[PDB]
Scaffold this active site. Structure first.
Site, mmCIF file in Angstrom:
data_model
loop_
_atom_site.group_PDB
_atom_site.id
_atom_site.type_symbol
_atom_site.label_atom_id
_atom_site.label_comp_id
_atom_site.label_asym_id
_atom_site.label_seq_id
_atom_site.Cartn_x
_atom_site.Cartn_y
_atom_site.Cartn_z
ATOM 1 N N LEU B 14 0.824 -1.203 0.000
ATOM 2 C CA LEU B 14 0.000 0.000 0.000
ATOM 3 C C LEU B 14 0.861 1.258 0.000
ATOM 4 O O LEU B 14 0.525 2.255 -0.640
ATOM 5 C CB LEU B 14 -0.937 0.009 1.210
ATOM 6 C CG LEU B 14 -2.004 -1.086 1.254
ATOM 7 C CD1 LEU B 14 -2.793 -1.014 2.551
ATOM 8 C CD2 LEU B 14 -2.931 -0.974 0.054
ATOM 9 N N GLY B 17 7.184 3.557 4.661
ATOM 10 C CA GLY B 17 7.437 4.457 5.762
ATOM 11 C C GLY B 17 8.907 4.337 6.087
ATOM 12 O O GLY B 17 9.604 3.494 5.519
ATOM 13 N N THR B 18 9.375 5.184 6.997
ATOM 14 C CA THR B 18 10.798 5.334 7.290
ATOM 15 C C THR B 18 11.475 3.989 7.581
ATOM 16 O O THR B 18 12.690 3.840 7.433
ATOM 17 C CB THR B 18 10.987 6.305 8.481
ATOM 18 O OG1 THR B 18 10.431 7.583 8.141
ATOM 19 C CG2 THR B 18 12.454 6.486 8.842
ATOM 20 N N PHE B 19 10.687 3.016 8.023
ATOM 21 C CA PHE B 19 11.172 1.657 8.201
ATOM 22 C C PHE B 19 10.057 0.654 7.929
ATOM 23 O O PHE B 19 8.974 0.754 8.506
ATOM 24 C CB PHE B 19 11.709 1.500 9.616
ATOM 25 C CG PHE B 19 10.835 2.142 10.643
ATOM 26 C CD1 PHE B 19 9.913 1.395 11.343
ATOM 27 C CD2 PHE B 19 10.902 3.508 10.879
ATOM 28 C CE1 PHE B 19 9.093 1.988 12.273
ATOM 29 C CE2 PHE B 19 10.077 4.104 11.801
ATOM 30 C CZ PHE B 19 9.172 3.343 12.500
ATOM 31 N N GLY B 20 10.316 -0.312 7.059
ATOM 32 C CA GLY B 20 9.349 -1.348 6.751
ATOM 33 C C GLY B 20 8.198 -0.800 5.928
ATOM 34 O O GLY B 20 7.906 0.395 5.980
ATOM 35 N N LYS B 21 7.499 -1.667 5.209
ATOM 36 C CA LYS B 21 6.412 -1.187 4.370
ATOM 37 C C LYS B 21 5.050 -1.465 4.977
ATOM 38 O O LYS B 21 4.926 -2.156 5.989
ATOM 39 C CB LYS B 21 6.479 -1.829 2.983
ATOM 40 C CG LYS B 21 7.810 -1.666 2.276
ATOM 41 C CD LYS B 21 8.104 -2.879 1.405
ATOM 42 C CE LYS B 21 7.543 -2.733 -0.001
ATOM 43 N NZ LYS B 21 8.529 -2.114 -0.927
ATOM 44 N N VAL B 22 4.028 -0.942 4.313
ATOM 45 C CA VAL B 22 2.650 -1.243 4.647
ATOM 46 C C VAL B 22 2.070 -2.076 3.520
ATOM 47 O O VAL B 22 2.008 -1.629 2.374
ATOM 48 C CB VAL B 22 1.808 0.029 4.846
ATOM 49 C CG1 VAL B 22 0.340 -0.333 5.011
ATOM 50 C CG2 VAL B 22 2.311 0.819 6.044
ATOM 51 N N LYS B 37 1.490 -3.269 8.771
ATOM 52 C CA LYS B 37 2.713 -2.478 8.787
ATOM 53 C C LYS B 37 3.858 -3.315 9.349
ATOM 54 O O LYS B 37 3.839 -3.703 10.517
ATOM 55 C CB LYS B 37 2.518 -1.204 9.611
ATOM 56 C CG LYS B 37 3.675 -0.222 9.544
ATOM 57 C CD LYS B 37 3.429 0.960 10.468
ATOM 58 C CE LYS B 37 4.570 1.962 10.413
ATOM 59 N NZ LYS B 37 4.393 3.052 11.414
ATOM 60 N N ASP B 131 1.860 14.977 12.257
ATOM 61 C CA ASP B 131 2.136 14.724 10.844
ATOM 62 C C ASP B 131 0.957 15.102 9.937
ATOM 63 O O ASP B 131 1.008 14.876 8.729
ATOM 64 C CB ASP B 131 2.531 13.264 10.621
ATOM 65 C CG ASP B 131 3.347 13.071 9.354
ATOM 66 O OD1 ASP B 131 3.740 14.087 8.739
ATOM 67 O OD2 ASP B 131 3.598 11.908 8.973
HETATM 68 C C1 LIG Z 1 14.367 -0.872 3.102
HETATM 69 C C2 LIG Z 1 13.941 -2.023 3.987
HETATM 70 C C3 LIG Z 1 14.643 -3.220 3.968
HETATM 71 C C4 LIG Z 1 14.243 -4.267 4.785
HETATM 72 C C5 LIG Z 1 13.143 -4.128 5.607
HETATM 73 O O1 LIG Z 1 12.755 -5.197 6.438
HETATM 74 C C6 LIG Z 1 11.825 -6.043 6.096
HETATM 75 N N1 LIG Z 1 11.199 -6.081 4.913
HETATM 76 C C7 LIG Z 1 10.280 -7.104 4.929
HETATM 77 C C8 LIG Z 1 9.357 -7.600 3.981
HETATM 78 C C9 LIG Z 1 8.530 -8.687 4.301
HETATM 79 C C10 LIG Z 1 7.530 -9.213 3.246
HETATM 80 C C11 LIG Z 1 6.160 -9.305 3.522
HETATM 81 C C12 LIG Z 1 5.277 -9.782 2.549
HETATM 82 C C13 LIG Z 1 5.765 -10.164 1.277
HETATM 83 C C14 LIG Z 1 7.120 -10.067 1.001
HETATM 84 C C15 LIG Z 1 7.273 -10.525 -0.338
HETATM 85 C C16 LIG Z 1 5.996 -10.866 -0.782
HETATM 86 N N2 LIG Z 1 5.140 -10.638 0.199
HETATM 87 C C17 LIG Z 1 3.719 -10.876 0.110
HETATM 88 C C18 LIG Z 1 8.006 -9.584 1.983
HETATM 89 C C19 LIG Z 1 8.621 -9.285 5.575
HETATM 90 CL CL1 LIG Z 1 7.603 -10.646 6.002
HETATM 91 C C20 LIG Z 1 9.539 -8.794 6.516
HETATM 92 C C21 LIG Z 1 10.368 -7.699 6.191
HETATM 93 N N3 LIG Z 1 11.342 -7.006 6.881
HETATM 94 C C22 LIG Z 1 12.447 -2.933 5.637
HETATM 95 C C23 LIG Z 1 12.845 -1.882 4.816
HETATM 96 C C24 LIG Z 1 12.087 -0.558 4.821
HETATM 97 O O2 LIG Z 1 12.428 0.320 5.565
HETATM 98 N N4 LIG Z 1 10.967 -0.362 3.964
HETATM 99 O O3 LIG Z 1 11.241 -0.933 2.689
#
Ligand SMILES: Cc1ccc(Oc2nc3cc(-c4ccc5c(ccn5C)c4)c(Cl)cc3[nH]2)cc1C(=O)NO
Ligand SMILES: Nc1ncnc2c1ncn2[C@@H]1O[C@H](COP(=O)(O)O)[C@@H](O)[C@H]1O
Ligand SMILES: Nc1ncnc2c1ncn2[C@@H]1O[C@H](COP(=O)(O)O)[C@@H](O)[C@H]1O
Ligand SMILES: Nc1ncnc2c1ncn2[C@@H]1O[C@H](COP(=O)(O)O)[C@@H](O)[C@H]1O
Lengths: 300, 373, 176
Positions: B14, B17-22, B37, B131
């Protein structure tokens, strides 16, 4: 357990503490004259006393203390009262309390109203400070006036016991014997002495016929400090009461055939500490205080 | 196999954000949609925001409001933290205005009432979002406003100010872009005013491609009011967009405003002589007055630690009580030629102590003031 | 119950096909779902040690950024320990976060915030109410010390504190 007694047991003191309030505190090393001037400035009738040495609340400073000091050390309008000028709250507390051995009477915010009213009655005081046991901070000063006014709003909703319907004569509430009174010409100093001896909150001011034309209250004494006229006590009580004269409705009075509920509804309305019980001719038959009413409602 | 957490099958992203996606997610049986998130625990360690993430999760989890995004569950894994929230299909309010343009006075008010309802709910709970903007305001299928990102949010503490500058420059209050101190509910009201303007005019009140020019526009508080704007809501905007924080509208002031009161649903708001002065003042130089205090603190045999050049934390042992009383010293600048020392009491978590916490705070200050005066 | 604990296996890098083999699946090939450059599978693992390897575009490899174990046969596998503090949110956040009061002799002062210039005792209240009562204070004003200019050798200090939902402004009269 009266219908009222149950209520007084259930609610706490915290329920009576207003959302935002002001609290004045005096250090015992403070000059006593300045302390009384401070009571006038902040519009407060009593303040907790803090001893900086032992780091605890020792007691309260009321207008009664101002009355005791005046009556004791007053000499004439020609000479100043040195003690009032020279003394500190600590110094006068020594002189007045040397044989008395009085502690500070306080109550917790979590304690009930039944406990508060009991504490006021047992120690015969009009000022009960509320202190949080944890922070050790004085929160609020509880009086008879607020407690009774609290209850009246709640009382209205609930069933009225036959107690409220009974007259005063048959309920025998109040003091009908040996009323402490002053004439209209009675000097303030004499009135102060009557305050000290009888230890009553107010003196009905009466004529030769004995009818009450006015009332002298311990509260009216504080006007001496307000106008700094405290050095002349030779004036009558009538001339001393001319300061509130711009707005004076009259002396509030109630009769013996009056129902109890009518009286309570009257006192809460006018926000005064007592009523003067009189015969039809205005002659004083006695007094009904707030402490009188509460003491009745706290018993079964 | 698929990617599944808490019986939810993780779908498309969706947003970020500054860490991890939504990421969107879908229940395997029911088909219920949630927005997950994903917080990377190693990334929140890199930024040392662990306290915040712990704090935001605590507060938001207790939140229940129609117009604030609900947090259903927080699932923890060795690598990551999964925040399962409610999913709204309308997307951003921002994208909605881009596509459909400005909203008529009726719909603008309807949404603004819902948004301010949420802003109020946060402030009651001692939480400042700060925000706030159409990008963080979402919509459901029925066009109900939803407040979404609390990442930059903070907790309001008694006697405390927030120096942090958060949010986009356009939605930031003049005190934020100036880097001054603020209480923070007045910062959210400024942003809410910009959102209200955005709803009405379909454009931003303060925008420039030249950043220094933009910051001047914001601090001047001067913005164009279109001719089709109701002069009633212009008065409201003028009040919310006040540069002076003290002259700026409060939530109480907005609820009393006639334009806001119209068609307001019942459910949105829960039923509702001597001259004093602050601390002590000195015209002496900041390093000179700061030097003075430290000497006096020692003179009273107090112990202090320096958190900041102008920020001291002082603790004292009452000889009689045997306990301790803590207070904070902060120097401010009243004027070019004037400076102010501020005294603030510190709550002790200790067992009930003899004496009075309030008074012992006064006595502690009294000794220092006596020297400095 | 505690035998199913969600664990994220994430391979960062590119590929057409990425599989996960471990002691948990009996070293079978578990296809990983991919989003851009990340390949992820989430598995419920018991408490204990688990060894695993990746199959990436026809090459058996391991994650160098993750803990590994080497056998006496020369096999290199990734290793992971499933533990209790990982699966409780506040337990995990507590491990992820990982003082001299005594005095010693020792940029502009932050501009005074306007909020503190609101003095609750300078504010005037209606003549029709109780003199002891006060307006509702801003939370930001609490615990801050206010004072009167020393006069007659007497200093007056005041501060507004909070008891539960109630506020008390205390005035102290002390001589100099
Ligand atoms: C840049 C960055 C790098 C790494 C990061 O850490 C993680 N990303 C992740 C993605 C996933 C994830 C979730 C669902 C997924 C995939 C694939 C298909 N589907 C359907 C990957 C998980 Cl389960 C854990 C994660 N931890 C977060 C970031 C960040 O800050 N946002 O990108
Ligand atoms: N809570 C209290 N503890 C100790 N002394 C009190 C208290 N309240 C009143 N007094 C004293 O009782 C006397 C009369 O009090 P009052 O009836 O309030 O005028 C004065 O000497 C007061 O200082
Ligand atoms: N003028 C008075 N003469 C005699 N007793 C009084 C007078 N005023 C009050 N009392 C009594 O003093 C007690 C305390 O009342 P108060 O001093 O008004 O709190 C009650 O028993 C009253 O009836
Ligand atoms: N029964 C009464 N009739 C007229 N005035 C009263 C009466 N009781 C008290 N007052 C006045 O009310 C003020 C405060 O009284 P109190 O606080 O009850 O001692 C003083 O001016 C008293 O003279």
């Amino acid at each position: 357990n009266s219908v009222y007694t149950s209520f007084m047991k259930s609610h706490r003191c915290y329920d009576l503490i207003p959302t935002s309030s002001k609290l004045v505190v005096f250090d015992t090393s403070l000059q006593v004259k300045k302390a009384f001037f401070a009571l006038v400035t902040n519009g407060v009738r009593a303040a907790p006393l803090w001893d900086s040495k032992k780091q605890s609340f020792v007691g309260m400073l009321t207008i009664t203390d101002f009355i005791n000091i005046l009556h004791r050390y007053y000499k004439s309008a020609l000479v100043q009262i040195y003690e009032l000028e020279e003394h500190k709250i600590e110094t006068w507390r020594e002189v007045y309390l040397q044989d008395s051995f009085k502690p500070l009477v306080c109550i917790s915010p979590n304690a009930s109203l039944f406990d508060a009213v009991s504490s006021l009655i047992r120690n015969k005081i009009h000022r009960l400070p509320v202190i949080d046991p944890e922070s050790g901070n004085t929160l609020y000063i509880l009086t008879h006036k607020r407690i009774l006014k609290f209850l009246k709003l709640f009382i209205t909703e609930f069933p009225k016991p036959e107690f409220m319907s009974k007259s005063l004569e048959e309920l025998q509430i109040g003091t009908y014997a040996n009323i402490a009174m002053v004439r209209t010409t009675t000097p303030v100093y004499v009135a102060l002495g009557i305050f000290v001896q009888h230890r009553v909150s107010a003196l009905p001011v009466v004529d030769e016929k004995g009818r009450v034309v006015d009332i002298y209250s311990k509260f009216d004494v504080i006007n001496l400090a307000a106008e700094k006229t405290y050095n002349n006590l030779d004036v009558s009580v009538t001339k001393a009461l001319q300061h509130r004269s711009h707005y004076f409705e009259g002396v509030l009075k109630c009769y013996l055939h009056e129902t109890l509920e009518t009286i309570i509804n009257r006192l809460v309305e006018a926000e005064v500490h007592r009523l003067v019980v009189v015969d039809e001719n205005d002659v004083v038959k006695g007094i009904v205080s707030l402490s009188d009413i509460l003491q009745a409602l706290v018993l079964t | 196999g698929s990617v599944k957490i808490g019986h939810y099958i993780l779908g498309d992203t969706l947003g970020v954000g500054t860490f991890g996606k939504v990421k969107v997610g879908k229940h395997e049986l029911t088909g219920h949609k949630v927005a997950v998130k994903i917080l990377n625990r190693q990334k929140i360690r890199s930024l040392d925001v662990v306290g915040k993430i712990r704090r935001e999760i605590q507060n938001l989890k207790l939140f229940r409001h129609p117009h604030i995004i609900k947090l259903y569950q927080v699932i923890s894994t060795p690598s990551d933290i999964f925040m399962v929230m409610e999913y709204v299909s309308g997307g951003e309010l921002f994208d909605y205005i881009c596509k459909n343009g400005r909203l008529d006075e009726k719909e603008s008010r309807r949404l603004f009432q819902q948004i301010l309802s949420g802003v109020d709910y946060c402030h009651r709970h001692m939480v400042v979002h700060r925000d706030l903007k159409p990008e963080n305001v979402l919509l459901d299928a029925h066009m109900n406003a939803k407040i979404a990102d609390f990442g930059l949010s903070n907790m309001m503490s008694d006697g405390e100010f927030l120096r942090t500058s958060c949010g986009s420059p356009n939605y930031a209050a003049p005190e934020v872009i100036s880097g001054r101190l603020y209480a923070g509910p007045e910062v959210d009201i400024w942003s809410s005013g910009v959102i209200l303007y955005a709803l009405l005019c379909g454009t931003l009140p303060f925008d420039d491609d030249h950043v220094p020019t933009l910051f001047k526009k914001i601090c001047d508080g001067i913005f164009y009011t279109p001719q089709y704007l109701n002069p009633s809501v212009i008065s409201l905007l003028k009040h919310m967009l006040q540069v002076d924080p003290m002259k700026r509208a409060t939530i109480k002031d907005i609820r009393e405003h006639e334009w806001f009161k119209q068609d307001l649903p019942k459910y949105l708001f829960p039923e509702d002589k001597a001259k004093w002065h602050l601390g002590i003042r000195s015209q002496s130089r900041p390093n000179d007055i700061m030097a003075e205090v430290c000497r006096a603190i020692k003179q009273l045999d107090y112990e202090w630690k320096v958190v900041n050049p102008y920020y001291l934390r002082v603790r004292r042992k009452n000889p009689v009580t045997s306990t301790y009383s803590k207070m904070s010293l902060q120097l401010y600048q009243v004027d070019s030629r004037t400076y102010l020392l501020d005294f603030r009491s510190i709550d002790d978590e200790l067992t009930p102590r003899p004496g009075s916490h309030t008074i012992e705070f006064f006595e502690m200050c009294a000794n220092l003031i006596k020297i400095l005066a | 119950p505690a035998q199913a604990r969600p664990t994220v296996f994430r391979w960062t890098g590119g590929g057409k096909e990425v599989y996960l083999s471990g002691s948990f699946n009996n070293w079978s090939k578990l296809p990983l779902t991919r989003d851009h450059n990340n390949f992820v599978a989430i598995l419920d693992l018991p408490e204990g040690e688990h060894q695993y390897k990746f199959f990436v575009d026809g090459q058996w490899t391991h994650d160098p950024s993750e803990p590994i174990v080497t056998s006496q046969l020369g096999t290199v596998n990734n290793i992971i320990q499933v533990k209790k503090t990982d699966f409780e949110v506040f337990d995990a956040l507590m491990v992820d976060s990982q003082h001299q009061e005594p005095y010693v002799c020792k940029r502009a002062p932050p501009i005074l915030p306007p909020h503190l210039l609101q003095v609750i005792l300078n504010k005037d209240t209606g003549i029709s109410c109780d003199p002891a009562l006060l307006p509702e204070p801003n939370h930001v004003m609490l615990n801050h010390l206010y004072a009167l200019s020393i006069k007659d050798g007497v200093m007056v200090l005041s501060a507004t504190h909070r008891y539960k939902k109630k506020y008390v402004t205390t005035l102290l009269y002390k001589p100099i």
